[PDB]
């Protein structure tokens, strides 16, 4: 974990799996995401062609995740990653020659890299969440539903966090459905804005809630 966190600084999100005359293929996320780059056809091999002028015919992203078998966290990861691909239109207008491909794989890797880690934080909160009084986690379409419950603190409420592809730098939007006690929106706004927009924002925001509210 400390070892790899260092690893994160220089990103390594993809495997090259074909480098044809015809196409270059790259996988991501344990290979559940597949990028096929198709090149224009030529009368010569690509060894004879200048990469600054080799035209890209196509850019085709694919999810190969088993949606029946996947857990919700993994599903949310794919939801968010491809929401970004949609926004960038598969880089079809800007990534047009082979020359431009590394800066695209970088741009994409970064979002793949944070979204995959968000997946990780969720599976974690799913196993240690009780210690934070986080009794349940519900994922529904870009919405993260956190249920905190403690008789002892006499508080029970549900916080809904709205996630995007751009995690975790963007400040999350939230709402609170209150069950027991009187935690207000302002109390939540506060706790959130005291956590920096960098890795583990979810984990840290949960721990922040568990101190501010369940450890008085």
């Amino acid at each position: 974990r400390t070892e790899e966190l260092l690893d994160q600084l220089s990103l390594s999100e993809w495997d090259v799996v074909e480098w044809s005359d015809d196409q270059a293929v790259f996988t991501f996320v344990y290979d559940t995401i597949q990028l096929t780059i198709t090149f224009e056809e030529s009368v010569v091999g690509f060894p004879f062609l200048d990469k600054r002028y080799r035209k890209i015919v196509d850019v085709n992203f694919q999810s190969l995740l088993d949606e029946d078998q996947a857990p919700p966290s993994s599903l949310l990861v794919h939801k968010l990653i491809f929401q970004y691909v949609e926004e960038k239109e598969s880089w079809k207008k800007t990534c047009t020659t082979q020359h431009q491909l590394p800066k695209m794989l970088e741009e994409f890797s970064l979002v793949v890299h944070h979204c995959r880690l968000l997946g990780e934080e969720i599976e974690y909160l799913k196993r240690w969440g009780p210690n934070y009084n986080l009794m349940n986690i519900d994922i529904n379409n870009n919405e993260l539903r956190l249920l905190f419950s403690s008789s002892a603190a006499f508080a029970k409420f549900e916080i809904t966090l709205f996630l995007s592809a751009y995690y975790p730098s963007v400040p999350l939007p939230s709402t609170i459905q209150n069950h027991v006690g009187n935690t207000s929106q302002d109390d939540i706004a506060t706790i959130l804005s005291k956590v920096p927009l960098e890795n583990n924002y979810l984990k840290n925001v949960v721990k922040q809630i568990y101190q501010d509210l369940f450890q008085d």
């Binding site: 344990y30 559940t32 190969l64 995740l65 088993d66 996947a70 966290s73 993994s74």
Partner: peptide, 9 residues
């Protein structure tokens, strides 16, 4: 984590 990231058959 193949567990969490299964592939279509």
């Amino acid at each position: 984590q193949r567990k969490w990231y299964p592939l279509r058959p």
